[PDB]
């Protein structure tokens, strides 16, 4: 029982074969060093640390999804558009997970039912020097079967184990875990779930999804979507101490129960002062320094893992990195594309959630109007995206003559193609927002800065598309960059010099001559 | 009379000494090849073409201001902020131009008072294959003395000489030339002016300015500002056939008279169909394909130039390039900074007009609120900038923890720091706009698409700053990128690989660890 099928170790072997893996044997400190090195090489190749300070049994990998190109190469996609379309198709066609025996699951080689000190086995890290606690943010929640209406859910939840085998469990209001906890908020028994660490890359990719429940509602099969993404079923295994299932090919597994009504503070400082929304926790998805809140507790009852001599791998990652941004926004883009295609097929050409747009904060859709009867569909798309993606603050629609991956080109569209009196939608003022946005959280006023007091401003949908029938007046003409060859005029040396001095919007403008 | 003092040739020598000059002897075609090569290397080093097709007496340089770094090095500035502050100081302290004798002016070595075929001596170019005419867009208008209220004006004006020695003269409504023509629209005598070609780089830098007349009103000394920028007075010389002055150190000079009431069409096609706003002319500053209009005529009476064996240099440049963008937006940024400093000193920290913002289209100001009594000044600044910069469509204010040069960071500020119900200003709906913006020009409806029928939407001022006293809640925390050294963990080879895979917002985030 020591082989993961399409597991993280196979991905590491593939990275090493492609030359995309950077290893080191120097001992890395989980306190400020892993996240520091990840931010120094933000959006770069994966880094594998063989020696982690005070964790002789663990290896740490980071920047696994830092470069979207290497991720697309790992999953067999040509480019971002191909990835979006293939992931939408996978969302509509899940692969049912397969259950294997308890004696052939690689993640159950070692089963600790006592001596449950999570902080001794799972690597907790500190992101910034301003933090006080070391937290665990590498595990994905896994709920399979009756508690998810016969489907399966996988997603990240940050945990702070400050009571040995009991830690806080951060749940986004409105998410799948929030819906499960709300349905069972007044039950007598706790919710049995497991946290998986070092899972297969497809499971991480699908766990990044969130707040796309018009496409992935409660009862869907997220593990099935991961299996369809990886081209084969994901293996499940029955837990040892609870009635649930786990990812058999993970590296660590925490079995336990979620107590919805047993809420405790995430940090000792906030627990002392007894207020939420202040007292920094660590950097969050909106790009701001974090805050600490009360949260339900996760009561661990068993710690399963691979053979400790094999040094099971854990994937710790800073929040404000290209890694986390890719992990969330990839399936977010695919789900937004699927929704727009459901509403009216053939109009949306591409969807992109750039790193700068705060994974749950905004998105960009590219629409192509084929005739006069399709004019106005971009506004329906913007309203539907803002309403079906809770707390999304800025959705932008652009035409097909726009480079959706260049923020400079988007800014140009905003400057030249937006009528400020009619092209700025504010669909749902007073709806549900995201508490982690400081602009929204500051609307609490003098109340507790939690989700119960914030007041959403309604989002912002910007229609920066060209009106149909005015494509000649809004034409970005072309420069003749294909009609002349620089080799006829200069030598290779000068051409390389001039090319090396180029960066930014000019790279996009020179490719298209636009 | 054959030495320009701080002239274009001295700048070429400096570029060659610094290794920033790329030369070639292959004959370049002014039709689609110069602009094509400039767009292939957009924002790169200057290119000098020694042989121009059908112009055996002329040399052509392009991308002279393509790289703002080489421009700042040429003028002796450390960075863009230093450039902005120094240029504001120069705006407030002009150097009076000096007049030299007619026999020592390098630009008057050859004086052609007959055989005035402008197209035979001045290199006209075609930008895109969609155009029909070859136009002259390398000369700057120069009005000195009584017709500019004792001051001096320099600025670009595109000319199409389709009547031998008479060509159209494109004038922006509201500009300095527009104000001069409006003051003398009903005079009997024409307006005597000269067009200078291959002028000193400081004169090009100052001619790029426009629509900043709260700082550079009619009657100012723009040539004095150029002299102050270059650190020495600009030399003037009395014209030969008219009562005016010219830049003595230019390469070509066209003396003549501007006939405000003698308006003709810019292209034969639009003249035939007899409509304006259609019938493409060439790419304009807003990044769109151009249109042709009626315009006053410039009646040339003499063509002065340097010795034709010296091959005088001409500076043709495509409109939608980093070159033109720098040329305009540099002094635009300095003037906006000066205005904001006049209104309330010490609040604005930096001003930037990115390439993506359509030189007259938008700007970004960075404000730092020092106390509670300064909260709200960013809105005064935005309103004043939108009102005193005619036709500006999008002004954005950001806080001091923002990278003003990264469009991704600006998009992040837009996503997380903008209240759509209170932070989007629309100050002056129905005011004066820019006819060359298609979004504005399409408001003409069924009328002629000219400046007489467009209806401005009012501009858009976005207050994306952090409210004072909430700097802890809007804190972009920091990652510990200075506390760990990658050399201790990896070798130089892997570090260079990981660094080479990085580009875009990650370069800004990794420098600040933010
Ligand atoms: C809002 C909440 C939780 C509430 O807590 P509070 O505002 O303090 O109010 P409350 O809970 O005490 O009272 C409430 C009363 O409503 C009844 N009630 C309460 N809940 C339920 C329920 N589920 N079902 C049925 N009834 C319920 C109770 O009956 C009664 O409560 P009880 O009397 O029973 O105790 C509040 O604490 C709170 O955490 N905000 C913040 C939570 C939040 O944004 N995370 C987002 C996580 S994204 C994230 O990280 C991330 C994502 C991507 C990338 C990086 C990162 C990072 N890095
Ligand atoms: C609007 C206009 C000119 C008017 O023309 P029209 O709309 O057709 O109306 P109109 O002139 O025939 O009539 C008008 C009537 O108002 C009276 N009147 C008219 N003018 C005056 C005056 N100055 N003073 C006193 N009275 C005056 C006349 O008394 C009567 O005219 P008359 O009867 O006497 O003839 C119209 O033609 C027109 O060109 N729009 C477009 C012009 C325009 O945006 N360029 C912007 C140039 S930025 C540029 O390139 C650029 C910049 C940076 C980087 C790259 C690039 C590029 N690449
Ligand atoms: C990639 C990644 C994502 C998340 C988190 C982290 C990482 C690295 C932590 C570092 C652990 C910090 C926090 N964290 C986190 C979180 N969602 C929560 O509800 N609670 C959390 O504490 N998301 C977003 C999740 O990935 C979403 O999937 C979300 O949980 C909704 O998913 P779903 O219900 O729709 O399936
Ligand atoms: C750098 C550059 C600027 C301009 C132009 C060109 C270049 C290369 C052409 C290729 C020739 C095409 C056009 N053109 C142009 C123009 N302004 C006009 O009123 N008319 C014009 O046809 N500007 C902007 C001018 O540089 C401004 O200075 C403007 O003229 C206002 O200046 P001012 O009155 O405030 O002094
Ligand atoms: Ca993305
Ligand atoms: Ca600029
Ligand atoms: Fe889920
Ligand atoms: Fe629009
Ligand atoms: Fe002027
Ligand atoms: Fe604001
Ligand atoms: K998920
Ligand atoms: K000027």
Contact A513 B475 (CB under 8 A): no
Bridge partners of B155, per DSSP, are: B141
Up-side HSE of residue A306: CA atoms within 13 Å toward CB? Answer: 26
Chain A residue at shortest CA distance from B289: A477
Q: Report how far residue B389's alpha carbon sits from residue B213's, in angstroms, rounded to the nearest whole number.
A: 8
Q: Nearest Cα to B220, choosing from B75, B344, B96, B83?
A: B96
A120-157: burial string, b at 16+ Cβ within 10 Å, e else: ebbbbbbbbeebebbbbbbbbbbbbeebbeebbbbbbb
Query: Which residues on chain A are in Cβ contact (under 8 Å) with B44?
Result: 498-499, 501-502, 506
Q: Resolution for this model in angstroms, one decimal place?
A: 2.0
Pick the atom of ligand 2 nearest to B263's CA: 35
For A297, the enclosing helix (H) or strand (E) is strand A294-305
- C-alpha B303: how far from its chain's center? 25
Note residues around ion ligand 12 (Cβ under 5 angstroms).
B 155, 207, 209
Query: How many beta-carbon pairs under 8 angstroms link A with B?
Result: 303
Considering every ligand atom shown, identify the ligand nearest to the alpha carbon of residue A156 and give its number.
3
Alpha carbon of B297 to ligand 9 centroid (Å): 19
**What residues contact B146, with CB distance under 8 A and at least 6 apart?**
none
Nearest CB to B44; choose among A130, A483, A501: A501
Q: Report how far residue A140's alpha carbon sits from residue A244's, in angstroms, rounded to the nearest whole number.
A: 15
Q: Report how far residue A205's alpha carbon sits from residue A64's, in angstroms, rounded to the nearest whole number.
A: 11
**What residues contact B163, with CB distance under 8 A and at least 6 apart?**
B264, B297
Q: Are B328 and B208 in contact (CB under 8 A)?
A: yes
Our mutation pick for probing the ligand 1 site, out of A275, A319, A450, counting the most ligand atoms within 8 A of Cβ, is A450
C-alpha dist (Å) from residue A309 to A59, A110, A233, A305, A313: 11, 11, 28, 11, 12
State the Cα angle at B279 between B273 and B283, rounded to 5°: 160
Tokens representing B107 are 């630009």
Q: Are B441 and B288 in contact (CB under 8 A)?
A: no
Q: Report how far residue B418's alpha carbon sits from residue B414's, in angstroms, rounded to the nearest whole number.
A: 6
Alpha carbon of B461 to ligand 5 centroid (Å): 28
Place of tokens 């340097």: B306
Place of tokens 């005011």: B431
Q: List the residue whose alpha carbon is closest to atom 22 of ligand 2.
A: B182
Measure CA of the first residue to CA of the last residue in chain B; give whole Å: 57
Phi, psi angles (nearest 5°) of residue A439 = -65, -35
Q: Report how far residue B475's alpha carbon sits from residue B381's, in angstroms, rounded to the nearest whole number.
A: 24
- C-alpha B462: how far from its chain's center? 24
**What residues contact B491, with CB distance under 8 A and at least 6 apart?**
none
Give B470→chain A minimum CA distance, Å.
Answer: 8
Give A98→chain B minimum CA distance, Å.
Answer: 38
The experimental technique used to determine this model is cryo-EM
Q: Centre a 10 Å sphere on the Cβ of residue A114 and count the other Cβ atoms it contains.
A: 8
**Strand ranges in A309-358 using DSSP code E only, listed in sequence order:** 313-314, 348-352
Ligand 1: residues with CB < 6 A are A 158, 170, 172-173, 181-182, 185, 276, 284-285, 290, 293-294, 319, 324, 328, 359, 435-436, 448, 450-452
Chain A residue at shortest CA distance from B493: A22
**What residues contact A105, with CB distance under 8 A and at least 6 apart?**
A1, A235, A237, A246, A248, A249
Query: Which residues on chain A are in Cβ contact (under 8 Å) with B395?
Result: none
**What residues contact B286, with CB distance under 8 A and at least 6 apart?**
A416, B358, B360, B361, B434, B436, B437, B438
Interface test with A, best of B362, B411, B482 (most A CBs within 10 A): B411
Q: Decide: A324 in ligand 3 pocket, CB within 6 A.
A: yes
**What residues contact A408, with CB distance under 8 A and at least 6 apart?**
A504, A505, A508, B354, B355, B356, B407
Angle between helices B407-416 and B505-512 (to 10 degrees): 80
Contact B41 A498 (CB under 8 A): yes
Q: Centre a 10 Å sphere on the Cβ of residue B25 and count the other Cβ atoms it contains.
A: 10
Q: List the residue whose alpha carbon is closest to atom 54 of ligand 1.
A: A285
Q: What is the DSSP string of B19-64?
A: T--EEE-SPBPTBTTHHHHHHHTTT---EEES-BTTBTT-EEEE-T
Q: Are B400 and B474 in contact (CB under 8 A)?
A: no
Nearest CB to A506; choose among B42, B477, B489: B42
Q: Are A10 and A46 in contact (CB under 8 A)?
A: no
For A14, the enclosing helix (H) or strand (E) is helix A8-18
Q: Report how far residue B81's alpha carbon sits from residue B85's, in angstroms, rounded to the nearest whole number.
A: 6
Alpha carbon of B28 to ligand 8 centroid (Å): 40
Pick the atom of ligand 1 nearest to A436's CA: 44
Q: Are B144 and B236 in contact (CB under 8 A)?
A: yes
Q: Are A146 and A184 in contact (CB under 8 A)?
A: no
Q: Report how far residue A191's alpha carbon sits from residue A184's, in angstroms, rounded to the nearest whole number.
A: 8
Q: Centre a 10 Å sphere on the Cβ of residue A395 and count the other Cβ atoms it contains.
A: 27
**What residues contact A198, with CB distance under 8 A and at least 6 apart?**
A8, A138, A250, A251, A252, A312, A313, A314, A315
Our mutation pick for probing the ligand 2 site, out of B185, B287, B434, B449, counting the most ligand atoms within 8 A of Cβ, is B185
Give B509→chain A minimum CA distance, Å.
Answer: 8
Tokens representing A356 are 């700068």
State the Cα angle at A296 between A293 and A297, rounded to 5°: 115
């Amino acid at each position: 029982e020591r082989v993961g099928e399409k597991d993280l170790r196979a991905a590491l072997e593939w990275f090493r074969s492609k030359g995309y893996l950077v290893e080191t044997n120097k001992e890395v400190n989980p306190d400020l060093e892993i996240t520091g090195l990840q931010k120094i090489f933000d959006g770069s190749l994966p880094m594998l640390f063989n020696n982690v300070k005070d964790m002789p049994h663990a290896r740490a990998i980071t920047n696994l999804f830092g470069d979207i190109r290497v991720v697309e190469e790992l999953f067999g996609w040509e480019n971002s558009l191909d990835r979006v379309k293939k992931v939408a198709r996978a969302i509509d066609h899940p692969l049912k997970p397969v259950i294997i025996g308890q004696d052939e699951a690689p993640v159950q080689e070692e089963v600790l039912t006592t001596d449950l000190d999570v902080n001794k086995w799972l690597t907790a890290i500190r992101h910034t020097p301003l933090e006080t606690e070391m937290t665990i943010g590498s595990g994905i929640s896994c709920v399979v079967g009756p508690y998810f209406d016969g489907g399966s859910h996988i997603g990240y939840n940050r945990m702070n184990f400050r009571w040995g085998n009991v830690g806080t469990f951060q749940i986004s209001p409105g998410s799948h875990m929030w819906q499960v906890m709300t349905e069972h908020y007044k039950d007598d028994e706790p919710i049995p779930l497991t946290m998986c660490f070092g899972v297969p890359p497809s499971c991480t990719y699908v766990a990044g999804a969130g707040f796309d429940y018009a496409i992935l509602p409660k009862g869907c099969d997220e593990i099935g979507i991961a299996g369809a993404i990886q081209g084969s079923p994901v293996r499940l295994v029955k837990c040892r101490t609870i009635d649930a299932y786990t990812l058999a090919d993970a590296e660590y597994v925490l079995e336990g129960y979620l107590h919805p009504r047993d809420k405790r503070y995430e940090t000792a400082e906030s627990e002392a002062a007894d207020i939420q929304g202040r007292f920094h926790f660590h950097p969050e998805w909106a790009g701001y320094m974090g805050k600490a809140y009360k949260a339900p507790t996760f009561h661990v009852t068993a710690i399963t893992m691979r053979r400790r001599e094999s040094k099971p791998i854990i994937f710790p990652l800073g929040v404000h990195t290209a890694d986390d941004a890719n992990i969330d926004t990839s399936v977010r883009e695919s789900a937004i594309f699927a929704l727009c295609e459901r509403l009216q097929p053939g109009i949306v050409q591409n969807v992109h959630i750039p790193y700068c747009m705060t994974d749950w904060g905004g998105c960009i859709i590219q629409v192509k109007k084929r005739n006069q009867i399709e004019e106005g569909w971009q506004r329906n798309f913007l309203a539907a995206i803002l309403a079906c993606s809770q707390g999304m603050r800025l959705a932008i629609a652009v035409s097909e003559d726009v480079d959706i991956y260049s923020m400079d080109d988007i800014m140009w569209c905003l400057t030249t193609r937006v009528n400020p009196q009619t092209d700025i939608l504010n669909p749902l003022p007073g709806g549900r927002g995201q508490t982690f946005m400081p602009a929204e959280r500051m609307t609490s006023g003098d109340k507790q800065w939690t989700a119960s007091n914030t007041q959403f401003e309604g989002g912002m949908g910007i229609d920066a598309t060209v009106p149909y029938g005015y494509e000649s007046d809004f034409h970005r003409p072309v420069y003749g960059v294909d009609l002349v060859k620089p080799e006829n005029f200069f030598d290779a040396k000068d051409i390389d010099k001039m090319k090396s001095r180029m960066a930014g919007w000019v790279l996009s403008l020179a490719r298209t001559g636009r």
